[PDB]
Amino acid sequence: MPLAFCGTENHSAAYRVDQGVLNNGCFVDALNVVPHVFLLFITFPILFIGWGSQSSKVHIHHSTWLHFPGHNLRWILTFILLFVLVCEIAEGILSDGVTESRHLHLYMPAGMAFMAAITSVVYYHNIETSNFPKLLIALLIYWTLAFITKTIKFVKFYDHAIGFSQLRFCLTGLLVILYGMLLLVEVNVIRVRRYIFFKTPREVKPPEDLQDLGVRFLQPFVNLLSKGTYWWMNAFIKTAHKKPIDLRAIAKLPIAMRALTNYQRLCVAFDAQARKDTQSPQGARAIWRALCHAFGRRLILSSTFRILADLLGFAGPLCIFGIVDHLGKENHVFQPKTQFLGVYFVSSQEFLGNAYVLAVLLFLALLLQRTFLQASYYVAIETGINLRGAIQTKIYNKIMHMSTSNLSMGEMTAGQICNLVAIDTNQLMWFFFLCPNLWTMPVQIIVGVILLYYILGVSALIGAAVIILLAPVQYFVATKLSQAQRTTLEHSNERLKQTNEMLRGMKLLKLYAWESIFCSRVEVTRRKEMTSLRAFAVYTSISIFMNTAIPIAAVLITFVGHVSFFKESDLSPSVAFASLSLFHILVTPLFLLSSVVRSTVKALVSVQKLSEFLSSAEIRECVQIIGGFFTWTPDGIPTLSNITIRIPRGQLTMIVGQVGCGKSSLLLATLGEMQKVSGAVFWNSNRSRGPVAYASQKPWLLNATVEENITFESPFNKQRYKMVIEACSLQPDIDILPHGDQTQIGERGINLSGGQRQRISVARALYQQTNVVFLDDPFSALDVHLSDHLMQAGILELLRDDKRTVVLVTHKLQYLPHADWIIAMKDGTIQREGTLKDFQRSECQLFEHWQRAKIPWRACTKYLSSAGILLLSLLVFSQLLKHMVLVAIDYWLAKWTDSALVLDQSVYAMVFTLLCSLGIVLCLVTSVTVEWTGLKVAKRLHRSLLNRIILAPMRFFETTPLGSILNRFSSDCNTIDQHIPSTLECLSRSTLLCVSALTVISYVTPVFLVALLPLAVVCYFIQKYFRVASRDLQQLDDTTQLPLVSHFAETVEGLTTIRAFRYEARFQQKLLEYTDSNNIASLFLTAANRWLEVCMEYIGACVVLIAAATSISNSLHRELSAGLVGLGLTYALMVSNYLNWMVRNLADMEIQLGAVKRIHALLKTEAESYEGLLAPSLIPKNWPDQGKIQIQNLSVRYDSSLKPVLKHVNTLISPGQKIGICGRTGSGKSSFSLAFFRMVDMFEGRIIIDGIDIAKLPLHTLRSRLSIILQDPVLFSGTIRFNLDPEKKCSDSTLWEALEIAQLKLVVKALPGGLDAIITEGGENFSQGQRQLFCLARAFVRKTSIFIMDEATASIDMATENILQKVVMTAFADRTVVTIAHRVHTILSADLVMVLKRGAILEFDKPETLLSQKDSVFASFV
Amino acid sequence: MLSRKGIIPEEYVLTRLAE
Ligand SMILES: COc1ccc(Cl)cc1C(=O)NCCc1ccc(S(=O)(=O)NC(=O)NC2CCCCC2)cc1
Ligand SMILES: Nc1ncnc2c1ncn2[C@@H]1O[C@H](COP(=O)(O)OP(=O)(O)OP(=O)(O)O)[C@@H](O)[C@H]1O
């Protein structure tokens, strides 16, 4: 009885070749073996020679691809003929398993056809990579050969009169037209590329996007299986573990996603609509129609994949119902009825009612659901990202035409348009991510409600009414959540600005011993934010609570209704577990549908925002102006008219005019940026415009290097840059910043001063090599007179050797009647534009003669010092107890259904209610404990970060910038307050559900764990490589969308400078490079996420296959009783999207715990301990009023490394002798001024204080009674009485003495509040003398005898005189001073003085006149 | 149990400053 091919019954009577050769029903299957082994045995030498040549030379293996025409339908026909060949294997096994013999002619041809079709697509792939089309002649003669043999078999089935009743007739007719239809695909290749029989072949090249050198993101040009399963990602993602992902390692990007290309497509759509339609604006509906018209051809494709993914989703619970129903009722028949020609044909009802066949059908349904779902995700993502590209370029195109009016720009500042780019366009992008959901998620829910009613009955409609009343509850909780988050975040903005004003003036607040009191003024605002954050935690626990206790209450209400209330159709375990798995596939879209509805409302609001922006007023469509009309409102009232002035080439026009008489309007009207109503503009550079150089009254600099704001995207030569840096006095300006030509100048970088920024803008105007140069008052704020004179003489000299026009419009009348062709604007009109002698004839000259490590160190430190074990134990215990209860509620359903099908039943229902009650109660406990632990976490970490940043030396603030401390304060507190606890609840639910699910799978099938261990290893490595790639692409996402919104700020601010140069096109390309570097980082983050999700979900599909096969096998024989088996299969389906969530939430927890690692690292910088090593009240007096601090040889250092400065200075301040001691400003001025206050490391010597020990004094009390003034003053915002004395807050009459008799009386008494008004962020237009007024106020009120002074940086001469008069009052009232003043030409008035240059005792003059008589002290005074 | 699959977009007025 050996392995016969045909039947071994009737003594080999099925081999009788009589009655025809083909009418023997086994010989036709013998024919079908022939073409498949023909292809294998003609394409094994081809494939192995090909595979060897890649093992010799594989460098060019990622170079150039060309798919043959008809490629996508080739692959989908191979997949669906693979599907039906698996079905004929299933039919063949189930038909031949009814007789005594083996009957191998039912599943030898189908099995070898399966391997032949797989090898016929590997051969096609190895011939599509290498353009050699004449070698797939073998494959087309295969398909015509295989089509003929199944044509033989099908027409003999019609002649043996099977008909469509038996199953293999239907399948064979289906796969006859399969091989026929892709044979027709093969002759399409013959027809198009014309290689076989045609005299001239058409030869195509690989496309230009592939042939470019660096393109890594090769997803739009790869075969269909690699688009489905992201196989190309592997060579990228495995590379990411050796070398990190630099921005050169990411792609350039393909042509289909370049920001210019999507912008072209979107502009074609807008132009086509506005021509054919009668819409006068391109308003809201116009933009809305245009986006759909340009991107519907992809968005419909994403929705198509999503609908197919939804239907193949419901072939999961349907397969559980079929499996468990057949696994009940004894497995009685297991044999086919039909017997045609002695062979048994399986009836199709017996086919799709079998156990293993329906299980393999379940497996193949999941490998198509969970691949079309991922293709649906990515196509929705990729079309959304191409909206980000085209809409940012569209917004920026209408930045390049926006007028700087008082109505267009006078309404919306650059903060509005930066928030427009960021918030608005991202939520419009998020609408096109969620766009297939509003087309499919209703079909998902509707087909879900319908077939859940067919499975169970009307009690399932009570259950479906519960979950369909869990979408509005999620919506209203999310609405209250967004309200609370709105109020909390715009409250903590005020807290972060207050912390910025308390951490910028670190030296000034530490000098008056005011780090503790200002920390309290921060802590009060923090606790108001903490109340708002507690409301955030309440409204986000209920989202967790509803997500994890609406389905349990739904299941409890469902089955208790069906048995107690209904008594209609008793379980039937198949009915119960099909209903459970349907509830999980319904619970996922429901909570997310609330977020979809939110995104739809925001999308409509967002296109409204972007429509009123896009259709606001534009600007418009040598020098000569005739008509003289120029306005800002686009009709009526010209703000500068009667302008009839001509300034041709070869000129340097100094201009003049009144204060606010239309000066900048006149210059900008020549610039063509004003809507000139009446008049013409003749224009010719030595009517179209040349690159007019310009520098506005308000300065402007790109947030870049100082040379980058000087050369301004132009070539760089050393000679002209050195001359412009010398003439504009820029070498002291470069040295004024600690890096010069590498420091990030301007805003977002090194904080400059007003004179410095005005001089930098003038430098960019001269260097840019232009046929005109406009200087709109450069010498207005720059009070350095000789700088302006050298600039004036140097501007004339530079342009005279260049022969190009200049125009300087200001009131600097020192040169205006001398050597210009001047023009004067009186009352907003032109009087005379001529020579200086004409102004000597119109009465106007009178005025000029008048690692890659991770969590567990940082996560342990986070959980310990933040939570506290009295709640850490409650959190971990409640999660584990809730999940044992969830295993119990599922297992109790299984045990009750087994004992109900084979028939204490009300006992089962009652204990089911008392297990569902524990489910809801434990989920509320876990939902409260996670968010409450996170709330307490943020409280103690914020007080620790504030106190350790307070209890720090000022030397640390010299080392690290204010940018680093403010960033890891504000943004990282946000991450550890509102993002880590929600991620913690999601992570502690996701990994615990996975351990729960695999314990249950291993419990039902103890064969699984042997097949789990290699599967868990593969799951572990996929997890490992994804973390390495996802972290690096995440930082590459963040640090690339930052410079782009930086660009949108820096463009809208200095708009008129860019349109002046006609250098708009270079900034257009800078955006497009930034947008390409953003979209390629965003697309790699998307495609790496999909590679994880496809690969981990296939691992989940293999879980389903192994679990279902071993469970049914152990329930046919070992009698599992099928209650457990349904409980097995309904968790095998849920594994596939718990491994996904475990790995993704672990990656998000990684990046977010990295923002608590940095806060602990910055808590690790502690110094300046308040060490009073005596009896701390006996060492000082009540207040030191001697002023007799004899400094004794106090030698200074900071790091104590290589160079002390102060040496042997045995110098005393006598009581009364207000010793103004100036020295060398290069070495010993600023260092000594800081170290005088015990704010530096005096490593030796003796620093006395009135003869007492100032090394063991209370440093709070020591820094209390010794006042100071500063060089660059700043006012901490608050009350004016808080600006005078926050630690005291003594009385108003002390403030009356202060704010009258010191200074500023006609500002304080003329203020609206007085001493109790809010200092509006520093006193933005108060004075510079308020610094000295606050100095004298704090010197008389805080018992301050000493007053250590520094010089004014920028002040008025009368303000310096008023400071001198207040200094006379300071000696008369405080009697102790030791002053150093960098304004050296005025610092001679003292009693005794010492000039101590380069760290020595070099000059001493106890009378003041002896310094001016001697040699060395006079030379520093000459 | 999905938060990143939810609407990740939130309000961002203050940004990362420097360093
Ligand atoms: C996985 O979600 C769902 C689960 C169930 C349902 Cl019924 C709908 C969705 C859903 O929301 N479908 C929208 C499409 C979607 C949304 C989020 C995600 S993702 O997993 O967050 N991957 C990323 O976001 N990549 C980002 C994209 C933005 C720039 C940076 C990279 C992936 C795809
Ligand atoms: N770009 C503009 N946006 C809004 N209003 C403007 C603009 N330019 C001019 N104006 C209006 O035109 C009038 C004349 O301004 P003018 O050109 O005299 O300023 P300016 O004198 O150059 O400035 P400054 O006096 O500071 O040098 C002003 O009252 C101003 O309100």
Q: Where does residue A1053 rank: exposed (0-12), middle (13-18), buried (19+ CB within 10 A)?
A: middle
CB within 8 Å of A322: residues ≥ 6 apart = A352, A353, A358, A574
Q: Residue A1113 has which token pair?
A: 């096998």
Query: Are A916 and A1023 members of one domain?
Result: yes
| One domain, residues A194 and A164 | yes
Q: Measure in Å the smallest separation between the Cα of B13 and chain A Cα atoms.
A: 7
Question: What spacing in Å lies between the alpha carbon of A1066 and ligand 2's midpoint?
Answer: 29
Which of A23, A29, A92, A173 is closest to A345 using CA atoms? Answer: A92
Helix axes A980-1004, A516-560, angle to 10 degrees: 30
Establish, for the pair of chains A and B, how many residue pairs have beta carbons separated by less than 8 Å: 67
Which residues of B are less than 8 Å from A989 in CB distance? 1
What the block records as the tokens of A799 is: 């342009």
By alpha-carbon position, which residue is closest to atom 20 of ligand 1?
Answer: B5
Dihedral sign for Cα A1201, A1206, A1210, A1216, please. negative
Structural domain span for residue A1268: 1190-1273+1328-1421
- CB-nearest to B12 from A423, A598, A961 is A423
Cα A970 to Cα A495: distance, rounded to the nearest angstrom: 9
- Residue of A187, A355, A251 whose CA lies nearest to A1117: A355
Domain count, chain A: 3
Ligand-binding site membership of A697 (annotated) = yes
Output the six-digit token pair for A117: 């079709």
Backbone angles phi, psi at A809, to 5 degrees: -110, 105
Q: Which residue has the tokens 């009517």?
A: A687
Cβ contact, residue pair B19, A961, below 8 Å: yes
Does A641 fall in a domain? no
Q: Is A73 in the same domain as A217?
A: yes
State both tokens at A980. 């880590």
With contact defined as beta carbons under 8 Å apart, do A413 and A461 qualify?
no
- By C-alpha distance, the chain B residue nearest A500 is B17
Residue A984 shares a structural domain with residue A1049 = yes
Considering the domain boundaries, does residue A1300 fall inside one?
no
In angstroms, the CA A1079 to CA A1040 distance is: 9
Cβ distance of A967 and B19 shorter than 8 Å: yes
Taking contacts as CB-CB distances below 8 angstroms, the residues of chain B near A934 are: none
Residue A890 near residue A1000, CB atoms below 8 Å: yes
Question: Is A1328 assigned to a binding site?
Answer: no
Which DSSP string corresponds to A934-1003?
A: HHHHHHHHHHHHHHHHHSS-HHHHHHS-HHHHHHHHHHHHHHHHHTHHHHHHHHHHHHHHHHHHHHHHHH
Exposed e or buried b for every residue in A549-568, given b needs 16+ CB within 10 A?
A: bbbbbbbbbbbbbbbeebee
Q: Which helix (H) or strand (E) holds A1027?
A: helix A1008-1053
A296 assigned to a ligand binding site: no
> A77, A111, A76, A74: which is closest to A92 by C-alpha?
A111
Q: Is the CB of A312 under 6 A from ligand 1?
A: no
- The answer to whether residues A231 and A270 belong to one domain is no
The ligand minimizing its distance to the Cα of A385 is: 1
**Taking CB atoms and an 8 Å limit, are A419 and B10 in contact across chains?**
no
Same domain (yes/no): A390, A443: yes
> Has A95 been labeled as part of a binding site?
no
Mark whether A94 and A218 lie in a shared domain.
yes
Q: Are residues A1090 and A1201 in the same domain?
A: no
Domain CATH code at residue A1109? 1.20.1560.10
Give residues with Cβ within 8 angstroms of A136, minimum separation 6: A123, A124, A127, A186, A189
Is residue A663 in a domain? no
Q: What are phi and psi of A1348, to 5 degrees?
A: -85, 120
A1132 plus A1265 within the same structural domain: no
Cα–Cα distances (Å) from A458 to A28, A59, A146, in that order, read 52, 64, 52
Proximal ligand: closest to the CA of A778: 2
A342: left (phi over 0), alpha (psi -120 to 50) or beta: left
Q: Tokens standing for A776? A: 């709109």
Contact between A1234 and A1240 (Cβ < 8 Å): yes
CA-to-CA distance for A661 and A198, rounded, in angstroms? 82
Name residue, tokens 């000493």. Answer: A1346
User: Tokens in use for A955?
Assistant: 């030397």
Taking CB atoms and an 8 Å cutoff, what residues of chain B touch A493? 13-14
What type of residue is A433?
Answer: F
The DSSP secondary-structure symbol of A68 reads P
The answer on A1237 and A1113 residing in a single domain is no
Written as six digits, the tokens of A619 are 């600007």
A1137 lies in the same domain as A1252: no
User: What distances in angstroms separate CA A869 from CA A26, A579, A864, A875, A987, one per listed residue?
Assistant: 75, 41, 7, 9, 20
Q: Which of residues 970-989 of A touch B (CB under 8 A)?
A: 970-971, 982-983, 986, 989
The HSE-up count of residue A1074 (CA atoms within 13 Å, CB side) is: 20
SS3 at position A166: strand
Instruction: Report the relative pairing of strands A1219-1220 and A1378-1379 from DSSP bridges.
Output: parallel
Assign residue A27 a region (left: φ > 0; alpha: ψ between -120 and 50; beta: otherwise): alpha
Peptide bond into A1177 cis (omega under 30): no
Contact: B7, A599; criterion CB under 8 Å: yes
Tell me the CA–centroid distance for residue A668 and ligand 2, in Å. Answer: 10
Rounded to the nearest angstrom, the gap between the alpha carbon of residue A578 and the centroid of all alpha carbons in its chain is: 41
Which protein residue has the closest C-alpha to ligand 1 atom 5? A589
Q: From CA A894, how far away is CA A156, in angstroms rounded?
A: 49
Short-list A554, A386, A538, CA closest to A463 = A554
In a domain, A792, yes or no: no
A913 Cβ below 6 A of ligand 2: no
Give A380 Cα–ligand 1 centroid separation in angstroms: 9
**B8 to chain A, closest Cα gap in Å:** 9
Structure determined via = cryo-EM
Tell me the best of A369, A379, A381 to mutate to test the pocket of ligand 1, counting ligand atoms within 8 Å of each CB and taking the most.
Answer: A381
Residue A589 beta carbon below 6 angstroms from any ligand 1 atom: yes
Return the residue matching tokens 């922006």. A613
| CA atoms A1127, A1130, A1136, A1137: torsion sign | negative
Query: How many Å apart are CA A555 and CA A452, to the nearest integer?
Result: 12
On whether the CB atoms of residues A878 and A887 are closer than 8 A, the answer is no
* Interface contact A971-B14, CB threshold 8 A: yes
* CA pair distance A891, A896, nearest whole angstrom: 9
Closest CA to A120 of A184, A74, A53: A74
Sheet containing A652-657: give its strands across. A772-775, A805-809, A652-657, A823-826, A829-833
Cβ within 8 Å of B, A 1044-1103: 1045
Name the residue in chain A with its Cα closest to that of B19: A964
Question: A113 near A178, Cβ under 8 Å?
Answer: no
CA angle A1262, A1263, A1266 (to 5 degrees): 90
Residue A1234, domain member (yes or no): yes
In a domain, A752, yes or no: no
Residue A538 falls within a domain, yes or no?
Answer: yes
Q: Is the CB of A780 under 6 A from ligand 2?
A: no
Terminus-to-terminus CA distance in chain B, angstroms?
A: 35
* Distance in angstroms between the alpha carbons of the first and the last residue of chain A: 124
Q: Is A663 in the pocket of ligand 2 (CB under 6 A)?
A: yes
Residue A1383 DSSP label: -
Between the alpha carbon of residue A969 and those of residues A367, A503, A572, A1159, the distances in Å are 47, 11, 60, 8
**Interface of chain B against chain A, CB under 8 Å?**
1-19
CB of A1287 within 8 A of CB of A517? yes
Give the domain-ending residue among A190, A208, A240: A240
The DSSP bridge pattern shows strands A652-657 and A646-647 to be: unpaired
Residue A777 CA, closest ligand 2 atom number: 27
Q: Does A489 touch chain B (CB under 8 A)?
A: yes
State both tokens at A262.
């999507």
Position of tokens 């009940």?
A: A328
Sort out which chain B residues have CB atoms less than 8 A from A599's CB and list them: 7
Q: Which residues in chain A are contacts of B1 at CB distance < 8 A? A: 547-548, 986, 989-990, 993, 1141
Contact indicator for A578, A318 with CB cutoff of 8 Å: yes
CA of A663 to the centre of ligand 2 (A): 7
CA of A633 to the centre of ligand 2 (A): 13
Spatial separation of the C-alpha atoms in residues A959 and A978, rounded to whole Å: 31
**How far apart are the C-alpha atoms of A317 and A586, rounded to whole Å?**
11
- Ligand nearest to the backbone CA of A812: 2
- Crossing angle of helices A754-767/A718-727, nearest 10°? 140
For the Cβ of A377 lying below 6 angstroms from any atom of ligand 1, the answer is yes
Q: Are residues A546 and A404 in the same domain?
A: yes
Q: Do B1 and A749 touch (CB under 8 A)?
A: no
A964-968, long-range: CB < 8 A, 24+ apart: A964/B18, A964/B19, A965/A503, A965/A1162, A966/A496, A966/A499, A966/A500, A966/A503, A966/B17, A966/B18, A967/B16, A967/B17, A967/B18, A967/B19, A968/A1155, A968/A1158, A968/A1159, A968/A1162
| Contacts with A1149 (C-beta within 8 Å, 6 or more apart), sequence order | A855, A859, A980, A983, A984, A987
Give a yes or no: residue A989 inside a domain: yes
CB neighbour list of residue A744: distance below 8 Å, 6 or more residues apart: A703, A704, A705, A750
Ligand 1 centroid to residue A385 C-alpha, Å:
12
| Nearest-CA distance A527 → chain B (Å) | 20
Task: Classify each residue of A1301-1318 as buried b or exposed e, where b means 16 or more C-beta atoms within 10 Å of its C-beta.
Answer: ebbbeeebeebeeebeee
